């Protein structure tokens, strides 16, 4: 979402995105760094392909061709600079000058040691509260961005944690068609479709590098659940780590976890969806966690088999037309686990990531909520060492991943929404360790 300096009047009147550095002559004298040679300001590129039919109401969604709704330049660094104003570094980089390499090391949760459970539980609990210093979320879709009265625009502060929350939630969230008619649901802009696992990769990266900047540790690194284990349970949800049932509330967290603290974002969808408006700061109920709960359905009450994560390895292109949930053959669509592990399309399986999710019941099993429950980060990380597994072993293949026709907001070029700098699915498809600055101590099963 946007930098704080961009989410003003006169930016969205320019419709430029290209904020000082630190300038050493006035304002603007510095944008993207010019004046040092880390970037510059320039037109943005987003996707002008078509998309598949599914979506109809092209002209009425500001996701459409991201962020081109919003703003038409933007910084474009230099070299390995990135970040908003050029002022940072490409991903595995570091250094003033963006030329120290670093690579950190994704582990296994239950690996940690005792000091690294807690330190990691702090951390996730630290960014939940702490304020994003870069980016603030609208409230408002672009028509009212700058407020009744045309000149307040309609941005809040957000924490860290829920800014994670809040762009999967704008990515899935209902186009609006008016008040009164019934929003269109059939888009989603990070799932069922090509698009899911580059998505969830630059989500967790961002939130990486949030926590890294948080706490001042460069290396900090995401860990893993693999969720993989045939169980019946959730071996991560103990009181040392992400926290167990309570005894007074089978669907609430233990009080003697931290997370039985946490308060959701974006659980109004009934407001956002019958007002037009967007999911905002303001936090409401608990986060609802029941793990094997869901009694109606015993489909989801087990967790995937470890030969599930094999067998989804087997399929060797990455995706498959309609480059859907009923894509047959697809490795993207067995991994989020709309088909079965073969890779075999059935409407009635859940496996995979998508089973992971079911298998809490809960707020982690709801698509507009999901990340509230902080084991969403556990499981992602998992599915991307899926992820860059597959990268691995079919040399990073994206011959598949298509260019055109693709669900709205799936083509290879579109710009990940809403992710700011704009940022394509094609600049994640790379394997991480030698692109990305980090790697999964991880072993597959064989
Ligand atoms: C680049 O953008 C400027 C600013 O327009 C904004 O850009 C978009 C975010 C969109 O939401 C517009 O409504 C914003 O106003 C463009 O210049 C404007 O062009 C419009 C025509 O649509 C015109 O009515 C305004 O008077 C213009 N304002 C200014 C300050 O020039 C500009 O055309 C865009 N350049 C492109 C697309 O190449
Ligand atoms: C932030 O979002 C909440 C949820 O949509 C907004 O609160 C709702 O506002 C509507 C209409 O004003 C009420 O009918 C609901 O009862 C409210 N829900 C709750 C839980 O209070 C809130 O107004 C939004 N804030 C801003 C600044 O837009
Ligand atoms: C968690 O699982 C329970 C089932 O164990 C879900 O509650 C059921 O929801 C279905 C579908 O609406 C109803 O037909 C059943 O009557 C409900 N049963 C009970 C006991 O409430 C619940 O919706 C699930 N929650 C989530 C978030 O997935
Ligand atoms: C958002 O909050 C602003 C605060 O900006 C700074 O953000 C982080 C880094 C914290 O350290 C905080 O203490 C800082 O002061 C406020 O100035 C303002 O009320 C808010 N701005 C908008 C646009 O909502
Ligand atoms: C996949 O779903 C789309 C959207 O409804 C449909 O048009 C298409 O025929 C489906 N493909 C199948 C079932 O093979
Ligand atoms: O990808 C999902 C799949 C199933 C359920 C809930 C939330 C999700 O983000
Ligand atoms: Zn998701
Ligand atoms: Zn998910």
Known sequence: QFPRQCATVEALRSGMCCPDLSPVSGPGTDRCGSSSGRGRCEAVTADSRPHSPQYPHDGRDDREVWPLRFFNR????????????????????????????????????????????????????????????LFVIATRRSEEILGPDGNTPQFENISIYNYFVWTHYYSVKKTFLGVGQESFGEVDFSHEGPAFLTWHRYHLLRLEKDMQEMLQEPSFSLPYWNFATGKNVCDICTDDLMGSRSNFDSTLISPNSVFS??????????????????????????????????????????????????????????????????????????????????????????????????????????????????????????????????????????????????????????????????????????????????????????
């Open 261 to 446: 603290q946490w308060r959701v974002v974006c659980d109004s969808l009934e407001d956002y969806d019958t007002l037009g408006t967007l999911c905002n700061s303001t936090e409401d109920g608990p986060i609802r966690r029941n793990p094997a709960g869901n009694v109606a359905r015993p489909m989801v009450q087990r967790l995937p088999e470890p030969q599930d994560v094999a067998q989804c390895l087997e399929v060797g292109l990455f995706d498959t037309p309609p480059f859907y949930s009923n894509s047959t053959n697809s490795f993207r669509n067995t991994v989020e686990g709309f088909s079965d592990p073969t890779g075999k399309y059935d409407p009635a399986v859940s496996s995979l990531h998508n089973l992971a999710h079911l298998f809490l019941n809960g707020t982690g099993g709801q698509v507009h909520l999901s990340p509230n429950d902080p084991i969403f980060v556990l499981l992602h990380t998992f599915t991307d060492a899926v992820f860059d597994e597959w990268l691995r072993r079919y040399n990073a293949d994206i011959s598949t991943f298509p260019l055109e026709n693709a669900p709205i907001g799936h083509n290879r070029q579109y710009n990940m929404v809403p992710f700011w700098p704009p940022v394509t699915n094609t600049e994640m498809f790379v394997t991480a360790p030698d692109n990305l600055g980090y790697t999964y101590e991880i072993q597959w099963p064989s």
């Open 74 to 133: 933007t910084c474009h660094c230099n070299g390995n600079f990135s970040g908003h104003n050029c002022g940072t570094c490409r991903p595995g980089w570091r250094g003033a000058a963006c030329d120290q390499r670093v690579l950190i090391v994704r582990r296994n949760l239950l690996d940690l040691s005792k000091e690294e459970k807690n330190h990691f539980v702090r951390a996730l609990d630290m960014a939940k509260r702490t304020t994003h210093p």
